Amino acid sequence: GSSSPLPKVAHNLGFYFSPDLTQFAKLPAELAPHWPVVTTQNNERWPDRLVASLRPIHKYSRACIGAGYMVGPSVFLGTPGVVSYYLTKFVRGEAQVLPETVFSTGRIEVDCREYLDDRERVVAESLPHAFIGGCHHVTSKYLPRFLPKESVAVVGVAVCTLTDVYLPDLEAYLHPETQSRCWKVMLDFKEVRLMVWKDKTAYFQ
Amino acid sequence: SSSPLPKVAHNLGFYFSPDLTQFAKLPAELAPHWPVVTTQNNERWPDRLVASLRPIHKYSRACIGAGYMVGPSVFLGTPGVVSYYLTKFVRGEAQVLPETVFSTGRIEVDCREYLDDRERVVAESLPHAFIGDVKGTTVGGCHHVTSKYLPRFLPKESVAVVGVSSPGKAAKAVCTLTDVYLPDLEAYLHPETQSRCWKVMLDFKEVRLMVWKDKTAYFQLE
Known part of the structure; x- marks a missing residue:
């Protein structure tokens, strides 16, 4: 399983829907190929996606150090110097460099x-x-x-x-x-x- | 006086109480018509659940090791020690409570x-x-x-x-x-x-x- 951003983080990367993460507004799995989406499912089927993970997944995965995060329904504090989750952004299929x-x-x-x-x-x-x-x-x-x-x-x-x-x-x-x-x-x-x-x-x- | 945590009474169908703060306030005039939890073994209330400090029945169950409340305050159960007794009345008549x-x-x-x-x-x-x-x-x-x-x-x-x-x-x-x-x-x-x-x-x-x-x-x- 993976941790995941607080809503505001994805929102600011331009993500609002998710088939799997309940801190975000629901979108059916079936429609993910046609809409950008935050998720913990690194699903090659969905070309515009933001994926949260606990291990990097591509050179461009950003280690989100010290952030607030969520796991299922629960919210957690960031631990300074400790990585909360990784984020890897795919636009039209290919991983993108995230701003610092x-x-x-x-x-x-x-x-x-x-x-x-x-x-x-x-x-x-x-x-x-x-x-x-x-x-x-x-x-x-x-x-x-x-x-x-x-x-x-x-x-x-x-x-x-x-x-x-x-x-x-x-x-x-x-x-x-x-x-x-x-x-x-x-x-x-x-x-x-x-x-x-x-x-x-x-x-x- | 010692009382059940809200969830214990909910599980038994009980949400109203005239007396116990941890529950939903119900005015006494209506207590005759709803199941209620109370520290009062009140005959006027046919469907009621009473939290005692000592039994009043064949069917009064001891709530052993249970967390409990006095007024606004919660307390831990101590294992082996009964925290309070509970008796279920339905249409004026005591009922056997599950183990x-x-x-x-x-x-x-x-x-x-x-x-x-x-x-x-x-x-x-x-x-x-x-x-x-x-x-x-x-x-x-x-x-x-x-x-x-x-x-x-x-x-x-x-x-x-x-x-x-x-x-x-x-x-x-x-x-x-x-x-x-x-x-x-x-x-x-x-x-x-x-x-x-x-x-x-x-x-x-x-x-x-x-x-x-x-x-x-x-x-x-x-």
């Missing part, structure tokens, strides 16, 4: 408010204005336990914007050459904008 | 630990039923609340189904799990044939248990 990206951790989905590890605490401590009052990281001190889920906006997909990205993945951004930079960041294959003010604050827009 | 095993409350309270040393050894004895292991891309044998590869969220069900994971190594879409006191299953773990399917009553629900001696063992719904 960072990954959401799954802390949002599973409502977890903790640092994943000491290294991430150490990064938050190094710029303590970052990601609170606007835009909160999942671990922000000021975030109340009961959020009203309807009115929350997620970075990479309003009461607030919210991210669960693993801080070290981002930490070079927090330290630009210029006094401040509006970066161009790939998160879950979606281009967001991280705005850094060296040594004061940073946040997404 | 059953009991979920322990661990899933409700998120306590993923053995109840006692004794259970530790059973889990350890049949590790591909009760602990887990991987073969390349596949995990199996994590069918208990104590097992490896478990998600953070577990359905509050007698037999819960979850996806399961060895981060970076293996995954399973479907894995079937309970929090039963493992020794209550010993009777079933040692057959002669290559496989066997038991019928088992768990939390008063009829469930099927596959056993592959001495490889794995898992519950399933009908």
Whole structure:
């Protein structure tokens, strides 16, 4: 069996249907040859496909490190430095190079408010204005336990914007050459904008 | 006063209660007309299920080792110790309740630990039923609340189904799990044939248990 992306990841690669994965909208097996589709079935029969796997499958399989993932009905947290799933994208039959990206951790989905590890605490401590009052990281001190889920906006997909990205993945951004930079960041294959003010604050827009 | 976990009463047909918070509020005026769970042996309610602390009948069943609640709070069963008594009245007259095993409350309270040393050894004895292991891309044998590869969220069900994971190594879409006191299953773990399917009553629900001696063992719904 294989793990598989959170919906937003496939969505951002342009995938919405799946015959086999229930986090996505259903499409019958029979129609997969004629529509792009996310799956864990590496089915040569379906030419436009995104396949999730736990072992690479072609040189172009991207190892999705540290991502939130799902297995059957369950959601799991990414483990930093550990590969969540591989993704291999086939357009009109042939495997395609994926852009490089960072990954959401799954802390949002599973409502977890903790640092994943000491290294991430150490990064938050190094710029303590970052990601609170606007835009909160999942671990922000000021975030109340009961959020009203309807009115929350997620970075990479309003009461607030919210991210669960693993801080070290981002930490070079927090330290630009210029006094401040509006970066161009790939998160879950979606281009967001991280705005850094060296040594004061940073946040997404 | 001690009460059954919601699933136990559901399995018996009972969803309304005037008194017990864990259930659906029903106003007293209607209690005469629905099956109800209650800590009140009330004659006015012909179809009722009473949770006692001591019996009131030939047919009053002891719920031994069962997880239970007092007000808003869940508590673990202790194995060997009855948690509460239950009596089924139908049209004013007590009924014989089937013989059953009991979920322990661990899933409700998120306590993923053995109840006692004794259970530790059973889990350890049949590790591909009760602990887990991987073969390349596949995990199996994590069918208990104590097992490896478990998600953070577990359905509050007698037999819960979850996806399961060895981060970076293996995954399973479907894995079937309970929090039963493992020794209550010993009777079933040692057959002669290559496989066997038991019928088992768990939390008063009829469930099927596959056993592959001495490889794995898992519950399933009908």
